Symmetry: C2
Subunit: 517 residues, 2 copies
C-alpha cells in the first residue's frame, strides 16, 4: 500500500494540524501577497552596505517579504537560525523570542511564538517571512524575522539531500524530491527552458514562422518507427500518434508559407535507454528555395548560437559521461563535413569503392558483431549504411555533418544533382557518438516521390516484421499542387539539451521520463 | 481511388514534363539562391520613388530576385503580365519577348522564351523571378522579368473559386488548397502564430518559466473527460494521453519552481463540433503565493495585451458568427466579474437562495429541456450549476469572470476563505457564450484533497458509464511534501484564437482538424 501513511514522521506531522487549527491558524492559507523573490533580494542588497544584527533589531535596515521552504533549522535558546529555499535561491533567517511573531498566534495563546516555531513548524514547511535584512560578520545575508506566516504544513520530511542509486531511480518519478534536493537538477532544467527560448529566438530572427500540426493522424510517416495507436470514439476510428513532423509541414510549404517550423512532441513506440524516450521533442524546420547545403549552415549556426548564449560567448563544452572518458567538444562553425563513404574510410579504415558487393559482406562479419541475416541479402547502398553504423558512428565525437547517403536510407530526398542516383542530398549531424540532426534537399517531384513510396511499400516492406502503411495519397496530391524546392531539418531537442547540460541520460533532461511500474 | 489521375488537366500538365526536360530544363531544380520575400520587397520600395516601365527596360531601377506561385497571367502579344503569390503577398510581373530570358532555355532551342512562358508554364507553377522594379501608370508595383526560372511544375490546376459545402469541407482536409486560394485563411493562421508568440512574451515578462511535461502517462486527470488510450510496447503497458496539464505542473510547484506554464496539446476523446476538436492546445500556468483574484487580473491582462498588440492598441473586436447577429466585444480590463449565483439572478431571472431545492428542480423542469434524470436527485450545488448552464452561459457575450462555483464542480480547488464550504474559489471566464478559462485558488491541503477525490470516486461508482478511476497516489504524496499556496489557470488557446480572428468554428483555426472519413 501507500507506505508513508504509517511512517512516524507523517503521523507526527499530521497530529500538528489540529493543534495549529486549534490556535486559530490556517495551515493552508490562500496567498502571501507582495513578496519579493529571494534572488531579487540578493541582487538588490548583496553589495549594499547593510547594518549588523543590532541595526536589524532597531528596524533600521531594509524590510522585506519573501517565502520559501524551511530547509535548515537550529534552535539556540532565545534565538533560532534557519535557511529558506526559494526557487533555487537560499537566504538565512533569524528568529528571536522577543522580536518574532507568528501570524494568527494570539497573545493570550497558550504557546509562545518562539516555541510555536520550534514545536509546530518543521523542516519542509513553506513559510512567509517578513523582517529586516542584515549581514553577519562573515558576510552572510540574513533576515531578522518580524512575522513568520505558515504557508503550507508539509506532512513528510525533506528528501534525503544526497541520493543513492535506489533513491535516484525513485526520483525520476518523484521528480519534486529531486528539484527540492539538487541544485544540479534545478540548473539542468533551467538550462533546458533557456535552450528552447534560444531556439525560438534564432528561428524567428531568420523569419521562420512557428506553427502547430496534429499529433493524432490517420496516417504516419516521415521516419522509420513503430507508431503508437489509439481509438477516437467520435468517429470509431483508429488513429496514429505522429512519429515526426515532416508531412504536415511540407503541406504548409505547398500552402505558400516559405519558412515554417514546429517544436513538438513526437512518439516512437520503441525501446527505452540513455538516448531514447518514446515521447520526445523535435524541431522540424523547412525553408523554401534552400537545399541541404543551406540547411547545413543553418543547423550549425543555430547550435553555435545556443552554445555561445549559454557559455559567455565560448563555443566549447565539457561532456563527462562517455565511456572513453571526459571530452571537450567545440561547437564552433563550420563543423566537420564528410560524405558517408569518406567517413567509412577515415574512421572505419575501409575505402568502400575499392570493394565488391560480396567483399563488403565479409568485412561486416569479420569486423563487426552484426547478425549474418542483416547483411546476407542487403543491397549495396544498405551495405554501406550498415558499415557506417558499425565502424564510424561511435567515433563521431566532435560535431560532424555526414553527407550523401544511399538512396535506400530515405524516400523523401532528392538525389545528387550531379546525376548520381544511388546517393541522396541528405545529411545527418552527429556529436558524442549520437545522431543529432537529419536534413534533406526535399523531394518535390511528385512522380518520383510516388515511385519511391511505392518501392518502399511493396519491395522493401514485404518483410514479415514491418507494419503495413498505405501510400499517403493526400501528400502526393499536395505535391501535385506544387511544393517549392526546399531544405528542411529535424533536430532531437532532448539530445541537444543533453550535450549542453552534461546529462548522462535523456532521463536527466525530462521532468518525468517513461518509467517501469 | 484518386480522381485527378484521370482528369484532362493532369494529362495536359504532366505531358509538359517531357517537353520541358527535352529542352534541358529541370522542372524540379534544387534551389533558388539569394531570394527575397515579396513582402520584404514591398516594404523597401512601395513608398519609394521608382520609375516607369521604360526606366526598367533600361535596367536603371532596383533589381530584385524573388519567387512564388503564378496565380494570374495574360499575354498581350509581345508583352505578358502576371501575378506572383508569395506567402500572403502578391506582386505583378511583366514579361517581354525581347527582354525576358528563361533559365536553361538555349538560344538554339525550338521555342522562344516568350512562347515557353505562354505554352510550357501554367497557372499554379512556382517560378523564380529576376528583374527590375517599376510602377505601372496606375501605381501598381511591378517587376520587368529579365530571367524567369521554373522552380516547380505543378501537375494540377489552381483551386477553384466557387466552393460549396463539399468543396470547403474538402479544404479542411486539403488545407494547402485552402491556403493558396483564400487570403482570409492565410491571415487567420498568420494571426494564430502571432498570438502564440504574444502569450509567451507576456508570460515570460511575468517571470513564468515555460516547461514541457509528458503527454503519455499511466494516469489521467485534472479535468472531466474520456481519455485516449494507447499501448507502450517496450513495457507491455497501457498508457493514457493527457486530458490536461494540471497535475504535472503542480508537482513542479512542489519542486520549488515558483511560476511555470506550459503550452501544449491535450486530448479529450469526446465529440466534434464548432468548439470541440479532440486534440487541442491549452496554456496552463501556476504561480506560487497567488490566489484566484491574482490569477483573474493576470488572465484579463494577458488577453488585453494580445488584443491591443493585434489591433493597433484597440481592445474591441468584431465577431460575426453568433445566432444573435454580429457583436462587438471589448476585452478591456477589468472584465465583468460576477459570482455564479449573481449571474443566475442577472441573466437567468432566478434568485437561487430565495428557493428551496425542489423549487430549483421545478425551475429546471419547466424552463429548460434537461432530461429529468439530470436534476431529479441532484444536490443543491449541482442544481445551481445546471441553472447556470441552461439559463446563463449562452448570454455571456461580453467577457465575464464567473466566480465562486459549487464545490461539486471540481475536486482540485480551495473552498471560500469566508468559510462557506459549499462553494470554491474558482472562476471561469466566458466570452461569446463559450468557456475561455478555468482557474483556481489551488487545493494544497493533502487530507482535504484525498477526501474530495474519494467523494468523487463514490459518486462515479453509481454511474455505470464511467470506469473506475484510481486516485493518483503520487500526486497526493507530492502534496504531502508540500505545495505552496498557488493560483493557476488554463485557457483554451484555440477558442481564444477563434474570438480574435472572427472564426466561426475551431476548424478554422486548426490547419488539419479532425474530419470524418
Ligand atoms: C530528430 C530526428 C533527426 C535527428 C536524430 C533524432 C534521433 C531521435 C531518435 C529517437 C527515437 C526514439 O524512439 C526515442 C527518442 O528519444 C529518439 C531521440 O531522442 O532521437 O531524430
Ligand atoms: C482550457 C480549459 C479551461 C477553459 C475552457 C476550456 C474548454 C476546452 C474544452 C474542450 C474539450 C474538448 O473535448 C475539445 C476542445 O477543443 C475543447 C476546447 O477547445 O476547450 O478548457
Ligand atoms: N522527419 C525527419 C526530420 C526531417 C528530415 C528532413 N526533411 C525525421 O524524423 O528524422
Ligand atoms: N486543468 C484545468 C485547467 C486549470 C484549472 C486551474 N488549476 C482544465 O483542464 O480545465
Ligand atoms: Cl547506492
Ligand atoms: Na420539460
Ligand atoms: Na462508474
Amino acid at each position: 500500500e501507500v507506505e508513508y501513511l504509517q511512517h512516524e514522521d507523517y503521523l507526527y506531522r499530521t497530529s500538528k494540524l489540529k493543534e495549529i487549527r486549534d490556535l486559530g491558524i490556517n495551515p493552508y492559507p490562500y496567498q502571501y501577497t507582495d513578496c519579493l523573490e529571494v534572488q531579487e533580494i540578493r541582487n538588490q542588497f548583496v553589495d549594499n552596505e547593510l547594518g549588523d544584527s543590532e541595526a536589524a533589531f532597531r528596524k533600521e535596515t531594509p524590510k522585506v517579504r519573501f517565502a520559501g521552504r524551511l530547509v535548515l533549522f537550529r534552535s539556540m535558546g532565545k534565538n533560532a537560525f534557519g535557511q529558506i529555499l526559494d526557487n533555487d535561491a537560499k537566504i538565512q533567517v533569524m528568529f528571536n523570542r522577543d522580536f518574532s511573531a507568528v501570524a494568527g498566534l494570539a497573545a493570550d495563546a497558550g504557546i509562545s511564538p518562539i516555541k510555536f516555531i520550534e514545536k509546530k513548524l518543521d523542516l519542509g514547511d513553506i513559510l512567509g517571512l517578513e523582517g529586516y535584512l542584515f549581514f553577519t560578520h562573515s558576510g552572510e545575508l540574513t533576515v531578522l524575522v518580524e512575522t513568520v506566516t505558515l504557508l503550507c504544513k508539509s506532512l513528510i520530511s525533506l528528501p534525503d539531500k544526497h541520493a543513492g542509486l535506489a533513491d535516484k531511480e525513485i526520483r525520476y518519478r518523484k521528480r519534486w524530491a529531486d528539484l527540492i534536493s539538487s541544485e544540479d537538477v534545478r540548473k539542468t532544467f533551467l538550462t533546458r527552458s533557456r535552450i528552447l527560448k534560444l531556439i525560438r529566438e534564432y528561428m524567428d530572427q531568420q523569419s521562420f514562422l512557428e506553427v502547430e500540426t496534429p499529433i493524432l493522424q490517420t496516417v504516419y510517416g516521415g521516419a522509420e518507427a513503430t507508431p503508437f495507436v489509439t481509438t477516437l470514439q467520435a468517429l470509431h476510428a483508429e488513429m496514429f500518434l505522429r512519429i515526426s513532423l515532416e508531412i504536415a509541414l511540407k503541406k504548409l510549404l505547398v500552402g505558400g508559407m516559405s519558412r515554417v517550423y514546429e517544436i513538438g512532441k513526437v512518439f516512437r513506440n520503441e525501446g527505452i535507454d540513455r538516448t531514447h524516450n518514446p515521447e520526445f521533442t523535435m524541431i522540424e524546420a523547412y525553408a523554401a528555395y534552400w537545399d541541404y547545403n543551406d540547411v547545413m549552415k543553418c543547423v550549425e549556426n543555430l547550435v553555435e548560437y545556443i552554445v555561445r548564449a549559454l557559455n559567455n560567448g565560448e563555443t566549447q563544452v565539457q561532456y563527462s559521461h562517455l565511456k572513453s572518458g571526459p571530452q571537450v567538444v567545440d561547437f564552433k562553425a563550420p563543423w566537420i563535413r564528410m560524405t558517408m563513404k569518406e567517413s567509412i574510410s577515415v574512421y572505419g579504415g575501409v575505402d568502400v569503392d575499392l570493394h565488391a558487393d560480396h567483399e563488403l559482406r565479409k568485412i561486416l562479419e569479420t569486423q563487426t558483431s552484426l547478425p549474418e541475416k542483416t547483411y546476407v541479402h542487403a543491397s549495396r547502398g544498405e551495405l554501406i549504411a550498415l558499415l557506417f553504423d558499425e565502424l564510424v558512428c561511435d567515433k563521431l565525437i566532435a560535431p560532424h555533418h555526414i553527407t550523401d547517403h544511399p538512396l535506400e536510407t530515405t524516400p523523401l530526398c532528392k538525389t545528387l544533382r550531379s546525376g548520381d542516383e544511388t546517393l541522396v542530398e541528405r545529411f545527418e549531424s552527429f556529436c558524442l557518438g549520437k545522431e543529432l540532426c537529419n536534413a534533406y534537399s526535399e523531394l518535390n517531384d511528385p512522380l518520383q516521390q510516388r515511385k519511391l513510396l511505392e518501392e518502399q511499400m511493396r519491395k522493401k516492406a514485404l518483410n514479415p516484421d514491418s507494419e503495413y502503411h498505405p501510400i499517403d495519397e493526400e501528400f502526393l496530391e499536395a505535391l501535385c499542387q506544387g511544393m517549392p524546392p526546399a531544405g528542411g531539418f529535424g533536430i532531437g531537442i532532448d539530445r541537444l539539451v543533453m550535450m549542453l547540460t552534461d546529462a548522462a541520460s535523456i532521463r536527466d533532461v525530462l521532468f518525468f521520463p517513461v518509467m517501469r511500474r
